[PDB]
Design a protein around this ligand. Structure first.
Ligand SMILES: Nc1ncnc2c1ncn2[C@@H]1O[C@H](COP(=O)(O)OP(=O)(O)OP(=O)(O)O)[C@@H](O)[C@H]1O
Ligand SMILES: [Mg+2]
Lengths: 124, 271
């Protein structure tokens, strides 16, 4: 499904990218945070955790994750925690490994965000 | 020996469902001649460890010795119950939140609001004498119930278990700035609870939900990191203003204890 959209549709891919740039900025701007590059600013897991709370209606206590991760291990933990929250929200377990997001596999970064946009379309 | 087997889930009469949410569901029901609510906790990755923990954590909520504390009547262990479940007596007016913000029939007057404050302060003073404190007990208007005679009672069935939604906060507007950021073990829990009471005072004064226009994530992040606070309400009595301000001191060490403010609130009732 999403494989064809990434690999075999460049024109549509960029209609979805700008969408996702608007989508995540719609929510993170409420925290005075801006997302200018889809492919590198989600890698440490922080904005994914913050996004999940903005999208499912909770705050995540700052002692529950690494607000400023100082290691590859901490970013992997953040991303894994974000995937857990995704699963608590009704999504099935994401297909990419948490390390794939931390390593900027764009097909993985976009797939996670695509499934977030798809699910939380009507959320304001 | 196994001290307590708990309540038999099979003995519960589920009458009508009141809620379904992140924790599970809540029903109105009956059990052994009692009108009750039944809180069904639906926990992902249930394990024998978590079930053991539930059965050790539940007895601490069975507090029958203070009028402003609403005990958990008992709990259903899982196994053999389908889910970890707890029961509490049905409170006809629902939560303080319901009474203040969702009251379609009457508006409670400010003498009743002062009595609610006194009730909550008395119950919190009692809970603060427990050794150790009940873990993961947050004070907010959704976690206080209003009984048939309008007595406010701290809801022990709203204390979060160790396995229950860890890492998520659905009522951050009542939480002390330090408690939004630091592990409970690195905070003075009693002082953090007094901040929650200060927000309750604000709620009783304004009859508004604190930060109602903001999402929970916005609330927690802006209170923790950007100094966001409720605005003192205009033109209230100096005595109420001073009490609100000292209970909401930015310095946790300078906030009063509940047993200190109980006599202040007593003198605030009617002669
Ligand atoms: N002992 C009770 N008696 C009467 N009504 C109650 C009682 N406890 C809860 N309720 C009511 O049921 C509603 C739903 O409460 P519920 O516990 O399911 O959600 P919550 O308190 O917002 O979140 P949480 O799951 O974290 O406790 C409450 O808003 C309240 O009206
Ligand atoms: Mg509850």
């Amino acid at each position: 499904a999403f494989d064809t959209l990434f690999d075999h549709a460049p024109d549509k891919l960029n209609v979805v990218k700008k969408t996702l740039i608007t989508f995540v900025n719609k929510h993170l701007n409420k925290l005075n945070l801006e997302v200018t590059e889809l492919e590198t600013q989600f890698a440490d897991g922080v904005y994914l955790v913050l996004l999940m709370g903005l999208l499912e209606g909770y705050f995540v206590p700052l002692h529950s994750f690494f607000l400023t991760p100082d290691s590859f291990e901490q970013k992997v933990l953040n991303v894994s925690f974000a995937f857990e929250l995704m699963q608590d929200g009704g999504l099935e377990k994401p297909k990419p490994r948490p390390e794939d997001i931390v390593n900027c596999d764009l097909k993985s970064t976009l797939r996670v965000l695509y499934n977030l946009f798809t699910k939380y379309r009507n959320v304001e | 020996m196994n001290k307590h087997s708990g309540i038999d889930f099979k003995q519960l009469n589920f009458l009508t469902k009141l809620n379904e949410n992140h924790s599970g569901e809540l029903w109105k029901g009956r059990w052994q001649g009692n009108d009750i609510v039944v809180k069904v906790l639906k926990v992902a990755d249930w394990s024998t460890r978590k079930s053991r923990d539930f059965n050790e954590e539940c007895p601490r909520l069975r507090i029958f010795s203070h009028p402003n504390v609403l005990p958990v009547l008992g709990a259903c262990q899982s196994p053999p119950a389908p889910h970890p479940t707890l029961i509490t007596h049905w409170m006809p007016y629902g939560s303080l939140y319901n009474v203040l913000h969702e009251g379609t029939n009457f508006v409670v007057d400010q003498s009743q609001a002062v009595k609610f404050a006194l009730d909550m302060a008395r119950g919190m003073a009692f809970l603060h004498t427990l050794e150790p404190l009940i873990p993961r007990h947050a004070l907010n208007s959704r976690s206080v119930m209003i009984d048939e005679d309008m007595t406010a009672r701290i809801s022990m069935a709203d204390v979060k278990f160790s396995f229950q939604s860890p890492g998520r906060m659905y009522a951050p507007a009542w939480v002390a700035p330090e408690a939004l950021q630091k592990k409970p073990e690195d905070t003075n829990r009693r002082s953090a609870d007094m901040w929650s009471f200060a927000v309750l005072l604000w709620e009783l004064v304004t009859r508004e939900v604190p930060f109602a226009d903001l999402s929970n994530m916005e609330i927690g992040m802006k209170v923790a990191l950007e100094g966001l606070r409720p605005t003192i309400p205009p033109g209230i009595s100096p005595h109420v203003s001073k009490l609100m301000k000292i209970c909401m001191n930015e310095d946790p060490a300078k906030r009063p204890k509940f047993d200190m403010i109980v006599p202040i609130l007593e003198k605030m009732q009617d002669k």
